[PDB]
């Protein structure tokens, strides 16, 4: 008769959270009352919420509770669950985090004497609109507040529009808008804008290297095309001045011998950084690997009436066109069982390399192609030895030579069993592009001895998304079954990513209860939960011409608009609001800290962002840290 409780590692105020309650090896109806208390003493916060675990639904259910704001450093709560007479208590961390603030300015860059128009979008941890009070500051390059607001988004549908007049006399540079929720002043959301004196250019200059990197042994050097066209579409005739340089983190080295003056004919020009000029500029060749090149082009129209300067920086100097990353791969393995590697391969700029063969070294020629998002699944079998597993994955892209192919090594440690018992759980999915509205199969793979295998009649699983329990159930199992498959329906609720953490429990050899756990992290394709599309009716228009704007979106949605002259982005294209910048911020906020698995059962639950506490003593350690560990 073991009673367990599962909640998030970190809890949130005035947000609904789930507590999954389980009776293992018990009969009849078991009354449960769940109370939340303050830690250093007894005050009782919220409490209530009543359930009865019935034998019909298999002694598993949940309570849905909401912690109110009561009133330095870490705030904890003692959470009690009474299974009949049995008290199971767990101290849990509490976040003051109210959600997310995203900030939009109308432009990237402003002159003195103009208006900065901006809005703040106030959303909760689910990316839904909330009404809270928000403190917003505009600061100068020196960081001095120049405008200071405190407002409420209550009843405003999550949108706060504000404006600021830049004075004629103002310091030029990188200005900032910093914004925080009133309740959570530790967590500041910022955006940036430039203040400069300028006039709009009439054309843009694109600077493009033929490869997005420089291979150090390439005799051709670095080839760049310069394209210039007017903002209205036509091709530019002029002259470009082009200069290359080197960058080693903060430091720039200009190579003056690289300076070239070329014609821009039909909107296009060609320029090369020679290998000799590059090397003569640094007074060895490999030592440049890890550094980067930049290229600065200045285009003057034949009229001489307009001139545009552009830069392309961050051209990595490299010995391989690919990088292998093991950051989506569990760093712990289950001896005896398969070990899955989510290999992530990128181009040297950080963009995911698609359609690239990767293979493990040793069990070599297996091969697997990376997907759209540049990941490949590779599975190796492990022998039942408690020994640090070293893994080397290499690129096997043909057309590349052996030296050109990428290489990376990782180490995974063995998942240590409860009492040197050799009971393991292992979870597995396919790595394909997962969109909402699809079904995903979760494989449960069991490892224990034939004599003890029959005891396990189910696995409990848990879905964690955006810091909270999304869905929890049971996956049933009959004796003799190695694999049982769960068909998990994927909805828009699963969007950015999610963790699946499963366990089974039993009373094994010599009287002692045991919990065996595994976890897997799963990506979900980025989109909006809903939809939003802007288009014209029909379709060039003439200045002052009326036209129809057509906006397709969700019913009852508030839509906020801007129109910016593309001449503005030619001067500055930094800091622009996009849907995927939003998701990245959502992902940085994940309370689960690893790609999956763990040191032991407690280590599994903890790293996936969950507490575990049983009636018979087995438990996750206390988490007293609001951020993930540093590597």
């Amino acid at each position: 008769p073991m009673y367990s409780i599962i909640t998030p590692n970190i809890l949130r105020l005035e947000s609904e959270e789930t507590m999954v309650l389980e009776a293992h090896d018990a009969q009849g109806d078991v009354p449960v009352t769940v109370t939340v208390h303050d830690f250093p003493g007894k005050k009782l916060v919220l409490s209530s919420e009543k359930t009865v675990l019935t034998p019909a639904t298999n002694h598993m259910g949940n309570v849905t509770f909401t912690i109110p704001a009561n009133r330095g450093r870490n705030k904890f709560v003692t959470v009690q669950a009474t299974f009949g007479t049995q008290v199971v208590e767990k101290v849990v961390l509490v976040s003051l985090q109210s959600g997310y603030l995203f900030i939009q300015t109308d432009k990237t860059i402003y002159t003195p004497g103009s208006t900065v128009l901006y809005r703040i979008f106030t959303v909760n941890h689910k990316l839904l609109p909330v009404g809270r009070t928000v403190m917003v500051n505009i600061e100068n390059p020196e960081g001095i507040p120049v405008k200071q607001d405190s407002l409420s988004s209550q009843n405003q549908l999550g949108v706060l529009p504000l404006s600021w007049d830049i004075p004629e006399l103002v310091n030029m540079g990188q200005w900032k808008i910093r914004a925080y929720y009133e309740n959570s002043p530790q967590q500041v959301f910022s955006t940036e804008f430039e203040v400069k004196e300028y006039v709009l250019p009439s054309f843009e200059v694109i600077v493009e290297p033929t490869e997005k990197f420089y291979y150090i042994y390439n005799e051709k050097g670095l080839e760049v095309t310069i394209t210039a066209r007017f903002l209205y579409g036509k091709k530019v005739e002029g002259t470009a001045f082009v200069i290359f340089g080197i960058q080693d983190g903060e430091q720039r080295i200009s190579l003056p011998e690289s300076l070239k003056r070329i014609p821009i004919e039909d909107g296009s020009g060609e320029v090369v950084l020679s290998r000799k000029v590059l090397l003569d500029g640094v007074q060895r060749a490999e030592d440049l690997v890890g550094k980067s090149l930049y290229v600065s082009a200045t285009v003057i129209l034949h009229s001489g009436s307009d001139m545009v300067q552009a830069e392309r920086s961050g051209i990595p100097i490299v010995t391989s066109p690919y990088q292998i990353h093991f950051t989506k791969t569990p760093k712990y393995f289950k001896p005896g069982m398969p070990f899955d590697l989510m290999v992530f391969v990128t181009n040297p700029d950080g963009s995911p390399a698609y359609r690239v063969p990767v293979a493990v070294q040793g069990e070599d020629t297996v091969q697997s192609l990376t997907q759209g998002d540049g990941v490949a699944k590779l599975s190796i079998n492990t022998h039942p030895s408690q020994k640090p597993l070293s893994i080397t994955v290499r690129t096997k892209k043909q057309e590349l030579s052996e030296a050109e192919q990428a290489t990376r090594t990782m180490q995974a440690l063995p998942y240590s069993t409860v009492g040197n018992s050799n009971n393991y759980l292992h979870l597995s999915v396919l790595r394909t592009e997962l969109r909402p509205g699809e079904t995903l199969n979760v494989n449960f793979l069991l490892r224990m001895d034939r004599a003890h295998e029959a005891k396990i009649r189910y696995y409990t699983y848990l879905i964690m998304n955006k810091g909270r329990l999304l869905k929890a159930g049971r996956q049933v199992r009959e004796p003799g079954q190695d694999l049982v498959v769960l068909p998990l329906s994927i909805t828009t609720d699963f969007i950015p990513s999610f963790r699946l953490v499963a366990y089974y429990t039993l009373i094994g050899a010599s009287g002692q209860r045991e919990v065996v756990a595994d976890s897997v992290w799963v990506d979900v394709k980025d989109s909006c939960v809903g939809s939003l599309v802007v288009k014209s009716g029909q379709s060039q228009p003439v200045p002052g011409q009326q036209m129809t704007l057509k906006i397709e979106g969700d019913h009852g949605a508030r839509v906020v608009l801007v129109a910016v002259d593309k001449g503005v982005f030619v001067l500055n294209k930094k800091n622009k609001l996009t849907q995927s910048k939003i998701w990245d911020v959502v992902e940085k906020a994940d309370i689960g800290c690893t790609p999956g698995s763990g040191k032991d059962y407690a280590g599994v639950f903890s790293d996936a962002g969950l507490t575990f506490t049983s009636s018979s003593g087995q438990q996750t350690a206390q988490r007293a840290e609001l951020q993930c560990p540093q590597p």
């Binding site: 069982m337 398969p338 492990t382 069991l446 190695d482």
Partner: peptide, 13 residues
Amino acid sequence: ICVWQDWGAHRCT
């Protein structure tokens, strides 16, 4: 493809 044990459909070898 397999789990080192002496039961189940996915035994090694």
